[PDB]
Amino acid sequence: VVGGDECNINEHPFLVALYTSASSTIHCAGALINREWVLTAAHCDRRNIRIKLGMHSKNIRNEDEQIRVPRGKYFCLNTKFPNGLDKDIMLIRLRRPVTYSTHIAPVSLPSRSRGVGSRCRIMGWGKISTTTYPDVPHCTNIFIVKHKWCEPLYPWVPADSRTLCAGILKGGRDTCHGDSGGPLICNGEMHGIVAGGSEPCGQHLKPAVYTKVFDYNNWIQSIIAGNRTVTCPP
Ligand SMILES: *C[C@@](*)(O)[C@H](CCCNC(N)=[NH2+])NC(=O)[C@@H]1CCCN1C(=O)[C@H](N)Cc1ccccc1
Ligand SMILES: *[C@@H]1O[C@H](CO)[C@@H](O)[C@H](O)[C@H]1NC(C)=O
Questions:
Q1: 13-106+215-227, what's its fold?
Q2: Is 45 a catalytic residue?
Q3: CA distance 179 to 48
Q4: Which residues lie below 8 Å from residue 69, measured CB to CB, with a gap of 6+?
Q5: Is 64 annotated in the active site?
Q6: 231 C-beta closer than 6 A to ligand 2
Q7: Which of 32, 33, 34, 122 could form a disulfide with 14 if both were Cys (CB 3.0 to 4.6 A apart)?
Q8: How far apart are CA 63 and CA 82, in angstroms?
């Protein structure tokens, strides 16, 4: 994330970090949903995902840090593009659950649908300048801007797709490489999964795309419950 600071150590207990069995670099984040389920971006998928929960600093371990691996991964299959980017979202089922604690806590799924001009916060362990990865997660605040801004810049995001266009129109504040799959939090609920935006990050007049979690609420809840024939919202 760019144009923000270190996150308060207790503000991100649902933030999980994704890296691969082969590499220690965080390639994406995600959100803990209940003891056994993480929500994240489809393009974050890889062959041997590892998930670190209850982390803040890459270097100073926490009491309650946990490493997990996937047992199930679940996608939208009815997507407007073969690569599935128009609907960048995925659910992972953890091999063993976790137990909650100060730094491990389920985020809250939206309840009402919130829109343009709301105040939202972004977090993650992705890039903070031109080529640096911070060792602690950074956070800042953005707003939902009007979709119009995103459409023209991102083909994979058609008009009236299920996304929130968000950022700071003037530059400085935005997510970046490696933030994918991390929550966009508004009124203490996850309204957003980081999908993408422009490279380099936070450039003038160039908001980013967040999968509108609220739309997938039912899809998410069937998937959790055990249903395997359910489809993503059209
Ligand atoms: C995979 C994620 O780390 C990453 C999120 C980066 C978002 N950054 C900014 N500036 N807000 N997503 C990207 O790499 C995604 C997946 C691959 C393509 N992509 C992009 O951001 C492209 N530049 C195009 C894009 C795809 C989907 C939605 C919007 C834009
Ligand atoms: C499974 O999937 C769909 C959800 O729309 C539906 O046909 C069915 O009611 C679901 N429930 C169960 C218990 O299989």
A1: Thrombin, subunit H (2.40.10)
A2: no
A3: 19
A4: 48, 49, 50, 51, 94, 95
A5: no
A6: no
A7: 32
A8: 42
